[PDB]
A paper describes a structure:
FH is a member of the regulators of complement activation (RCA) family that are characterized by possession of repeating compact domains, known as complement control protein modules (CCPs), sushi domains or short consensus repeats.
In this study we describe the crystal structure of the three carboxyl-terminal CCP modules of human FH (CCPs 18–20) at a resolution of 1.8 Å together with analysis of this region in solution by small angle X-ray scattering (SAXS). While the long axes of CCPs 19 and 20 are approximately aligned, with only a ∼32° tilt relative to one another, the long axis of CCP 18 is strongly tilted, by ∼122° with respect to the long axis of CCP 19, and by ∼151° with respect to CCP 20. The short (three-residue) linker between CCPs 19 and 20 (i.e. between the last cysteine of CCP 19 and the first of CCP 20) along with numerous inter-modular contacts imposes an approximately linear rod-like structure on this (GAG/C3b-binding) part of the molecule; the longer (six-residue) 18–19 linker permits a sharp kink to form in the molecule, also stabilized by inter-modular and module-to-linker interactions, but with a smaller inter-modular interface than observed between modules 19 and 20. Atomic distances consistent with hydrogen bond formation are observed between Gln1101 (CCP 18)-Gln1156 (CCP 19); Lys1103 (linker)-Asn1154 (CCP 19); and Lys1103 (linker)-Gln1156 (CCP 19). Interestingly, though, the experimentally derived scattering curves did not fit well to data back-calculated from the ‘J’-shaped crystal structure (discrepancy χ = 2.4); nor did ab initio low-resolution shape envelopes generated using the program DAMMIF demonstrate the same acute angle between CCPs 18 and 19.
Residue numbers in the entry: 1045 to 1230
Amino acid sequence: GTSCVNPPTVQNAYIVSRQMSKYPSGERVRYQCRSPYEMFGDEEVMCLNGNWTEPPQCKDSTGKCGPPPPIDNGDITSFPLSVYAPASSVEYQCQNLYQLEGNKRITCRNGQWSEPPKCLHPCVISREIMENYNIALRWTAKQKLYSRTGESVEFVCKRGYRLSSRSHTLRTTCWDGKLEYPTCAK
């Protein structure tokens, strides 16, 4: 219960202590930054009862940033340079049906990018599940096969069924692929 695995990945650094698959509590992992990066924080990261202590960073001493980080199901809306001046910004776009969460723009400050956004998954609305659970969509308006993250999806029991005594509610919010279905019974 108190050993650790997977020492933190530190960009522009390598580990110079001996690597192993499981680190006992108390083991110290030592990082070194690649030239010409400057280290910030402690060069050693210890395993304390299953959690690592805080890792260092290896940054450009003039505050420049490297390429912006990739994000799942999204991409930047410009050519990715190898080097950005401090205060430069870039922006992201999510793929079709994905929902951007957080600021679409990131900025290079103090040698690191501000937090990029996420692209959250749409939810499948399964015909087969609905059939099996005796439910349908309340608004048969266009053929919505998917909901977007953040959208309410409302179902009804099919003609002649009522909500099963332990069912989820008939209205639920799609979130990052998660849709809770209700069930109805004769």
